[PDB]
Structure formats: structure tokens, C-alpha cells
Amino acid sequence: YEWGVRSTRKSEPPPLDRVYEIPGLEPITFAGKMHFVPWLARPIFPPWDRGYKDPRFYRSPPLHEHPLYKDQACYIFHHRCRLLEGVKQALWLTKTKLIEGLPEKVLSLVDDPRNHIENQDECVLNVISHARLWQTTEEIPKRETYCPVIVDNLIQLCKSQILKHPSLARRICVQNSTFSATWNRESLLLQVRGSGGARLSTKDPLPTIASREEIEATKNHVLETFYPISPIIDLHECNIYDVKNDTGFQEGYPYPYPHTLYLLDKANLRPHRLQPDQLRAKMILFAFGSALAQARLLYGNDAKVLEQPVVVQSVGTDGRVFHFLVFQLNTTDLDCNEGVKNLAWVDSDQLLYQHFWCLPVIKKRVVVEPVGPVGFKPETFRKFLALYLHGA
Amino acid sequence: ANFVSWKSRTKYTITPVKMRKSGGRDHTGRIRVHGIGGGHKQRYRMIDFLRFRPEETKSGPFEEKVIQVRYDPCRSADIALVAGGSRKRWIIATENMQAGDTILNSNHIGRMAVAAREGDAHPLGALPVGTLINNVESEPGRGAQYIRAAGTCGVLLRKVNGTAIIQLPSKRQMQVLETCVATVGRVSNVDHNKRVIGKAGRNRWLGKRPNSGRWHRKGGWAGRKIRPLPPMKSYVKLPS
Amino acid sequence: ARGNEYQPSNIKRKNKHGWVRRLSTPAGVQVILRRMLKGRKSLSH
Amino acid sequence: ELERVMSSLLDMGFSNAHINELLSVRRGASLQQLLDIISEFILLGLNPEPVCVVLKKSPQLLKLPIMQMRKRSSYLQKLGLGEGKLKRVLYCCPEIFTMRQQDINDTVRLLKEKCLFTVQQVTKILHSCPSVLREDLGQLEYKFQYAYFRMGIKHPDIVKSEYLQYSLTKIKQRHIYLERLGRYQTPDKKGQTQIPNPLLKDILRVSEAEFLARTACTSVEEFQVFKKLLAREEEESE
RNA sequence: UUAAUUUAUUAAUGCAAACAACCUGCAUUAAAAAUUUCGGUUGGGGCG
RNA sequence: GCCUGUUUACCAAAAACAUCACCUCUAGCAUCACCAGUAUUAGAGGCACCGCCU
RNA sequence: GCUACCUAAGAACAGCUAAAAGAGCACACCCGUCUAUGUAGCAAAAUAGUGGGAAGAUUUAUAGGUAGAGGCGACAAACCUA
Ligand SMILES: [Mg+2]
Ligand SMILES: [Mg+2]
Ligand SMILES: [Mg+2]
Ligand SMILES: [Mg+2]
Ligand SMILES: [Mg+2]
Ligand SMILES: [Mg+2]
Ligand SMILES: [Mg+2]
Ligand SMILES: [Mg+2]
Ligand SMILES: [Mg+2]
């Protein structure tokens, strides 16, 4: 079955006048008249050259002629790619071993109550209420508005800890930063072009979480595979691409080391929003991409086991549900499935609050649920603060 | 009228396509089919009825993972998003197809009969006689056209030479080259018969509208009548 | 109840009786030609 | 080759005895043609031993072109004559595969259009008595209209009791006798009669003896005289 | 409408024509139609 | 009359039309309706939800 | 540009009762049961009260489409600019 019905397909041009089939004579066309007439032959116009040149009337050359066109087809993961297998596919692509829960090294940074924010719950509740109810004159703010607001206000609340932690002065949250990292996986060359937003950069690299012994123990772990789904599925197969490793910044940039990638799924529509598993996969891929760009910038473009692993964190949220990730890139030798493997600690589906009532539900003239968040969980904010404080 | 068919998309896709209702109207704008109009807005999911469609630069039998089984507004059967290699496609789901199941699409006519597992597609030559089938092609590579509605199942009645006799759900025999592919099992949504519309409003939701003057010929509907022969004219309307 | 059959809209007026629609068919061209022959100040609507 | 043909006939359900019988039956018919013909017959749902019997009775079938044989088989399948239905058809009238497509089609079209028989009824008629195909048009229409208008019979009864199988001469001989005797009455415009009419099985299916003893209650001599009189009447009318 | 007249047009077949499809001509049968009519006497109508 | 609905704009809102339900008839199939459908489908006609006794 | 049906993309539907309803009462809104007024009238079909529906087979704005032996018709020979 062929798609596209004939009536919609472009109409076939009318048959050429028989006068054109007679070798010796020049047909008399309405070309001289400069307008159509039905009783004269239709001219054969030579193709027009000066057309597709003006900037506002430009036609791009065929993809084959573009400077970066390559016969070998790369598989790019961009911000709007949704992995079918999700976390498993991301782990295979990045040669990563998954560890449930955040590492104790970062989780201990908030165990002591000194790091606990004064009026922490009050401030977080005010942040949630402002994002979800008080943000606008409109009664119910949309996700496109309350997800960035909740993230930024939480980041400010964490940054308020500069009192206890002067090391927090050596960091800055940049927006619209874009990184690109290419690497091979079983003769398949994969690129990640991470655009996202809210890259938390620090002047100092994050300390490694996994020790040499754990990194070596990753050798025994077998990289889970899925069949018949190829790991390439849902990745943009593109022949136009650049193999350069771009960290997103010019050389000499202060705060060169990525600290946390804040990915937010703020689409108002559920189909336009990532599933939680696909969001975790995107977090894995973006953290791996930033770490790999850093590694290629620092230790050169050589496939090898990293003596100093690169650690990149990421927080992926939909405004209510958060996912926390710490990714340790400890190898740039990705092509083989064997050897030491990168490792990611993920804490999944940490919901800051169960639900938010913008309107007071009234049954039989009785207020059942008051306006505000329900099922608020300070533990998720503790984890968020721990991730922010890591490295300080 | 300025009617252009909505079926203009040329490239297969998984995304539901916005389909325009017709109201039973031709491209001329006149009613051609009565009783159609309105109903819930629908999106069309392009079904790949050629189950043995090996991916680009690939060949041979291939397996596919059932990502999900979904209700289809445009069919009695429910459909299945199924993914193989690096592609995803919509196929017609069989009765017991589940998410996470594995499906085989083969062009191999084995000398022995292949074990017929529900949901997989084999050439009709490879199936045992008496197996229930659906999504049957008429010609090799044409694409499934027969036994596609919910709960339907043809029977592989016979296989002789390179020709197989299939019993269509209308209990009519059909001859097809044994190289034509069909999938094993009955189509899903087997309870489609038992659904009760309940009220006229549900049919109106389904897009069926009450329509009269369905014939447009002079005098409207007129049942066929036997025209008596001249010898028999004397007995047509004998009085009591 | 009746009498207000005219519910004006310039889009409909131009699309139904305008110069372009009149010229779009040979019959409408003859409409314009008849109006021109009669000397109508307004050829189309 | 004979090897391939023998292997195929070992398949398809045929036993060596019937295979040898058919091979002997071959009247200069190539093994390829015989294999194709038998394949088409079993495609039509016919069992190996009825295939053997039919080919024995009518060897002319093996001479049919394979294209024509396939076209006729497809047409019969469309008409619904297949599986066990085709068996008694190929016994009562084995020439259907030799009849003209136009003849079969016009018989079916007369049955459906000018006689208002459902598709199922047409299949039932063809299955029960293929002599309808031999019977010429016009005569068939006259028989049907005799059953419908003059006799007051309906399509379900005409199909149930194989009225079209019986000859028009016999039908008239018995019906006119009954009507003139007053034991049979044409239904009125309302479709009713003063006395219930005898059944078509009692009229046509039975023999002359019981027909004149139970339905007519008259004498065989009187019936013979009436038959001769009716023959004269028909000859004079035509 | 079982009033009269047609079948131009479609749909089937058939025969020629072009070498199966497609198409032309001529026929036949239908479908769909088209055109046309409504004598006189007897309170009216039925049957006359 | 099953029901909610529809109708003679401007004398009829109904028992009429429709309607779920059921029955009958026709159709084995692709790129402009039916339908990007395939007999649990589609088209047409009848009847009247349903339930029981024969 | 009315009306009938359809297409595309919109919009409206308080409150109470009930709980995912071609649900109940009842606004907006749609209609037009009955009565009265009016009858060259305010009106070439209106007014007042009463009444039916009022989350649906609902109502409705916009643009488009189907054309006269044709269209459209939940058939009233209804409607297609009084
Ligand atoms: Mg209007
Ligand atoms: Mg009623
Ligand atoms: Mg009502
Ligand atoms: Mg009225
Ligand atoms: Mg009224
Ligand atoms: Mg309400
Ligand atoms: Mg209601
Ligand atoms: Mg209506
Ligand atoms: Mg009526």
C-alpha cells in the first residue's frame, strides 16, 4: 500500500505539443507574447538561475552537498528525542551501570541539621505556593509557567546557604548553554547535542564518588541488552553532523566544570511531556554528554580509562516530580562492551508534593481540602539541597 | 467544490494524522453515502498492513517487540504499536497480543510446517492446514486486505501446489498464492459484537447520522418486482 | 420572523459576487460583459 | 515429469490405485495437464475418489484448457458451488465445466434479476438440480412465473420443493388437472384460498398413482384422457 | 401504472472492428428515464 | 408511543419521523465518497427498546 | 449572508440535587404547549403570561460546500433569500 492518493499528488504536466516532435521546424509559442494564450504552443522555458539566492527566497542545497555531510550516519540525541527503552537504552548507549539511590557521599551532606535551612519547610512551601497558585492573576498557572519558577526558586533557596558554605560563591547557573559530544558504540557513532537549560557551572570539578575498586568492579557487570529493539531506536539518524566535542563555552571561561544540569519538562500537554523513564534517560544522556565533553577537553580526544573520573549531576523535574542523578564518567573507551563502565546513581520519582489544590473543593457547602499543597515531602528537597551542596 | 482528500501524507509515520470527515460527500460536494456526518473528532494512525516489511538495508525474517496495544478510533480492531530494530509501526493486534510480547515476521516457506504461534506472520505456505489466520493478502506483497475487522478469523482450508484455499469470515473460499503472508490467530477486540450502543447519541458520536432520501431516484426506494409474462398476466391479481 | 435574510459579511460578499469570482468562470465574464454593455456603474459586488 | 506428478498425487490424498486408474484414463493428456486439472478439482474442495470417479465418467474434462478450467472453477467458487456441493453437481450434470460462461451467467442472472431469487436460493437450486443450466432461458422464466403467479407459490417453497427440476409439461399436466377439478385454487390478491391447496410434494414429487389417488381422487383413465386433451390444447395454442 | 411511444444514455451480453485490456459500429435484453393523452350520454360514483 | 430527541420557518409537536434492539437483502474489495475501511465490515430495506408463551 | 444537511477550526452552558448520566429541578441560552392581546399590528408571525429542553442526537459565531427535475430532508412534499 502506497501513501498519498493520486488526487492529492502533484498533477502531471500536460502533454507536449506535437509540434515539438517534428525535427526541422521552430514551434510558434506565446513566449514572445509574454503571456499565455490557448491557441499557441506552450514554450519550453529554460530553468531560472537567479532565483534561490536571495536570503528571503533561499533554497538550501541538497543534503549531499552540505559541508558536514558524511556517508557514515551518526545517531544524534537532541532535547526532543524520547528513547523507547528509556533508562536501559541510555545505560547501553553510555556504557553505564545503574545504582538505585543517591550516593552516601552526597546524601550525608544534609544529614547534619546545620545544612538544614532555617524555616526550610516554610520557604519551600512558599515557593510551591507561589509557583502553583500565586504566580499570576490567573487562578491556575500552567506547567510552562510553574516548572521554571519552582526550579529557579528552589535553586535560590539552596543558594541562600552561602552563609554556611562560602564555597558556593564559586558557581553560577548559566542558561541556554549547549554542549555536543560524540563517541562510538560498536561501530555506531552517537552524538548528543544537549541544549536544555540551567547548567550549574562551578570553578572546581566535583570529587569522584566511586573509588578505584568500585570502578574496577564495574568490569564484571554485564551491560543489559534489549532485543529486537536496537539501541539506536528513537535517535535521529543524521548524515549531516559535526564530530567536534563542544563544551558550550569558549576557552578561558570561568566556572568551566559542569556541576548540575537542571532539565525541566515544562510542556503543558502530557503527550508533549516526557515520560518519567524517558526523562531519566535524557538526564543520563545529557550528563554523559557534558561529562564526555569535559573529558575530551581535559584529557584529550583519546579513548581510554580516565585516571580522574568526571562527575556531573542532573536534576530532571516536571515541576512536581523530580529525578536526581549523579553520573561518574570513568572511561572514554566506549566502543567495546567490556571493561570498566561509567556509573550513574539515580533516585527516581521523588515527588516534592503529592498534589496542589488551586481551588478549595467544596462538597455540600463544606470545604473538604483547603487551598495549597497536599502530601508535601521535605525529603525530596533534602536530596535537592544535597545535590546542590555537593562539591562545597 | 474545492475538495482535496485529506489522505495526502506520503511518508509513513507513527504520529496520529488529523483526518477530515467527509459527511458522505464526494469531491463534488454532493452526498454520495447517506447517514454519515459529525461524530467525535478522530486522528488516523497509519497501519502497516504489510507485516513482512524488512527494514531498510535489511532482509530476512525479523522479530518485533509489542510496545503497546491501543484502541483505534478508525477500526473495530485494536491496534498494536510494535518496534523492530530502529523503527516503530502500527499493526493490527491479534486476540491475545500483549505489551512486551514478541512477534515474528518471516518470508521463509519451510519444508515442514512452522509452529503457528498467535500474532506472528508467515507465508501461507508455511502454515499448517486448518490454522486460524487474519490480515490476509490477495497477492504476494500486496498488503493485508482481508480478515481485518475485530474478532475475525479465516481458516487455511487447503494447500495444493503453490496455491492455498482460505475460508474468509463470510465463509467464502479464496485462492491465494502460498507465498502471500498472513498472520496467525483471530483479530483482537473479539467482543466487538457484544457492544450495545444503548442510545442514539452513541451512534451520533460514532459519526452515524439519521438520514432519509437515501435513493435520489424518482419515487425513492422501490423494491424489485417480478414483471409477469403475457400468458401469466391473467393471474397476477385474481380477485377474491 | 422573516425579512432579515441579509446577514451582511464582506468576506462572503466579495467571495460570492466579487470581480475575481465573476472572472473565474466564462459565465461570470459574460455577466460582467452584460453589465458593461448596459452601462452599469457597478460591474461587480 | 512423471516423477513430480507421481509425488504430487501421492500428496493431495490420492492413493496409488486411483493414481494408476487416472493415469490409464489419460487419453493422450500430458501429465502436467492432468496434474493441473486434478489440482483445480481438489482446490474446488472435491475429494480424491470423487475426482477419480468424475474423471472416469467424463474424460473430456482433462482436455479443457487450464486457463478456462481455472476461470470456470473461480466462477463456481463465486457462485458458491464448492466442497461437497460440487460432488452431486458433477454427477448429475458433469458438463458445467464445459458449458459456456455466458450460458451459466445468463441462467444465474435470470434466476436473480427476472426471478428475484436470493444468492443463497440460487446456490441451493444449482446444488440440488443442475439441469436448470441445461434448460434454456425463456422456458425457465415461464416455469418460474407459472409457479409464482398461476400456482401462487413463493420463492422459499419453489426452492424447498425442487419445482425447477420438474418438467413444464408435467407441471402443467398436474396443476391444470387439479385446478379444473377444483382441488387447487390460485390464491387471491390477499394470498388466501377458500380451501387449503395440496402441497407441491403431494402434487409433483409423488408418482401418478398416489397423485391421482390422494390429491386428485380420480381415475387413471380420466387422467390419461386429460393429458392428451391438454397436449392438444397446448399444440393448438402454440 | 400491466396507458401509448422510444432507448438517445448507462449496464449487460451477442456479432463485426482493432489484436486479453481498451475502443468503435450494429443488434437484443434490462435499468433508469423521457415525451404524451385522459371521447360522448345518463344528480354523482360503482357496476353497467 | 419503549425512552431522550425530530417535524409541517408562518393555523397540525402528535399516536407521525428518528431511535437504541432485532431481522432481511446486497458486496471478497485498495489510492477522491464508502475508506486511507475489509464480513464482529460496508451499503440498503423492514420492524420496533426490552422481557415472556407458542 | 435565510433555511436544510455537511466540512474546518472555535465558543457557551449559573445555582442546587446528584455522581462520570442523550440524569432531576431550575438561570443564561434554544424552543414554541396553551391562553389572551395584536390582526395595514411593534411585527408580511409580534407581545404578555404559561410551558418544553437546558453537559447534549445541545445551542451557537466564523469561513467553506451541495443548485433546480437538481440540492437537502430524524418524510412535514418539508426547506433551498418573506
Ligand atoms: Mg446566520
Ligand atoms: Mg415518543
Ligand atoms: Mg420529548
Ligand atoms: Mg406550523
Ligand atoms: Mg404549533
Ligand atoms: Mg449546569
Ligand atoms: Mg438532561
Ligand atoms: Mg434535521
Ligand atoms: Mg408522510
DSSP structure string for A165-189: -GGGGSEEEESS--EEEEEEETTEE
Task: Report d(CA A296, CA A182) in Å as an integer.
Answer: 10
Segment holding D69, helix H or strand E? helix D66-79
Give me the CATH code for the B107-187 domain, please.
Answer: 2.30.30.30
Cell of A9: 499528488
What separation in Å is there between the alpha carbon of B201 and the centre of ligand 7?
13
Report CA(C5)–C1'(G39) in Å, whole number.
24
Locus of grid cell 528537597: A381
Sheet containing A305-317, strands listed edge to edge, beginning at the edge strand earlier in sequence? A96-100, A342-351, A321-331, A305-317, A257-264, A199-202, A171-174
- The DSSP bridge partners found for residue A77 are A192
> What is the rounded CA–CA span in Å between residue A194 and residue A288?
10
Q: β-strand A305-317 against A257-264: which pairing, if any?
A: parallel
A227 touches chain B (CB under 8 A): yes
CA D72, D76, D77: angle at the middle one, nearest 5? Answer: 115
- Select from D36, D57, D45, D54 the least CA-distant residue to D13: D45
Spatial distance between the Cα atoms of A77 and D65, rounded to a whole number of angstroms: 63
Alpha-carbon distance A276 to A284, whole Å?
12
Q: Name B87's bridge partners.
A: B84
Rounded CA gap, B59 and B54, in Å? 5
The dihedral region occupied by D205, where left means phi > 0, alpha psi between -120 and 50, and beta the remainder, is alpha
Question: Any CB–CB contact under 8 A between A240 and chain B?
Answer: no
A205 within some domain: yes
What residue numbers bound the domain in which C17 lies? 1-45
CA dihedral B110, B111, B115, B121 (to 10 degrees): 30
C-beta of residue A295 within 8 angstroms of C-beta of residue A289 = no
CA distance B180 to B122: 8
In single-letter form, the type of residue at position D112 comes to K
Residue count (chain C): 45
Tell how strand A342-351 and strand A321-331 pair up.
Answer: antiparallel
Tell me the three state secondary structure of residue B173: strand
Give the ranges where chain A is alpha helix by DSSP (H).
87-94, 104-107, 120-129, 143-159, 212-217, 276-298, 378-389
Resolution of the experimental model, in Å, one decimal = 2.2
DSSP letter for D212, please: I
Quote the CA–CA distance of A72 and A189 in Å, as a whole number: 8
CB atoms within 10 A of CB A391: 24
The per-residue b/e assignment along A205-239, b for 16 or more CB within 10 angstroms, e otherwise, is: bbebbbeeebbeebeeeebeeeebbbbbbbbeebe
Output phi, psi for A28, to 5 deg. -95, 110
- CA dihedral sign, ordered D50, D55, D58, D63: positive
Is the alpha carbon torsion for D177, D179, D181, D185 positive or negative? positive
CB of B54 nearer than 7 A to strand F: no
Q: What does residue D230 show for φ and ψ, rounded to 5 degrees?
A: -65, -35
| A154 grid coordinates | 528552589
Residue B196 grid coordinates? 450495545
B200 Cα to the center of ligand 8, angstroms = 15
| Cβ within 8 Å of residue D175, ≥6 positions away | D146, D150, D151, D184, D203
Dihedral sign for Cα atoms in the order B192, B212, B42, B19: positive
Q: Cα–Cα–Cα angle for A112, A113, A118, nearest 5°?
A: 150
Residues pairing with B71 in the sheet: none
Secondary structure (DSSP) of D75-132 = HHHHHT--TTHHHHHHHH-GGGGTS-HHHHHHHHHIIIIIT---HHHHHHHHHH-THH
Q: Is the dihedral of CA C28, C33, C35, C36 positive or negative?
A: positive
Of the candidates A337, A334, A349, the residue with the CA atom closest to the CA atom of residue A383: A349
CA A244 to chain centre: 18
Q: State in words which class domain B1-106 has.
A: mainly beta
- The Cα B78–Cα B72 span in angstroms is 5
- Other CB atoms within 10 A of residue D53 CB: 17
Q: Within 13 Å, how many C-alpha atoms sit on residue D133's CB side?
A: 26
Determine the Cα–Cα distance for residues A162 and A154; give it in Å rounded to an integer: 14
Q: Domains in chain C: how many in total?
A: 1
Q: Describe the crossing of helices D85-92 and D48-57 by its angle, rounded to 10 degrees.
A: 10
Instruction: Return residue ranges of chain B for CATH 2.30.30.30.
Output: 107-187
Query: Cα–chain-centroid distance for residue A78?
Result: 6
Contact of B67 with A84, CB cutoff 8 Å: yes
CA-CA distances (angstroms) from residue A358 to A118, A132, A188, A309? 27, 7, 49, 46
Flag whether A47 is in a domain: no
Domain boundaries, chain D: 1-238
Cis before A228 (ω within 30): yes
The answer to whether the beta carbons of residues A171 and A201 sit under 8 Å apart is: yes
Phi/psi of residue A252, nearest 5 degrees: 90, 5
B-chain CB neighbours of D176 within 8 Å are none
Which set of grid coordinates corresponds to residue B104?
A: 515474528
Contact residues on chain B for A84, CB-CB shorter than 8 A:
67, 83, 88
SS3 track for A225-275: CCCCECCCCCCEEEEECCCCCECCCCCCCCCCEEEEEEEECCCCCCCCCCC
The closest of A243, A246, A206, A248 to A345, measured between CA atoms, is: A206
SS3 B125: helix
The structure was resolved experimentally with cryo-EM
**A51 lies in a domain?**
no
The DSSP 8-state label assigned to residue B25 in this structure reads B
Q: Could you tell me which residues of chain B have a Cβ less than 8 Å from any Cβ in chain A?
A: 4-5, 7-12, 27, 46, 49-50, 62-65, 67, 83-88, 102, 143
Main-chain phi, psi angles of A356, to 5 degrees: -125, 125
Handedness of CA D194, D200, D201, D203 (dihedral sign): positive
Q: Which residues of A touch B62 (CB under 8 A)?
A: 228
How many domains does chain A fold into?
A: 1
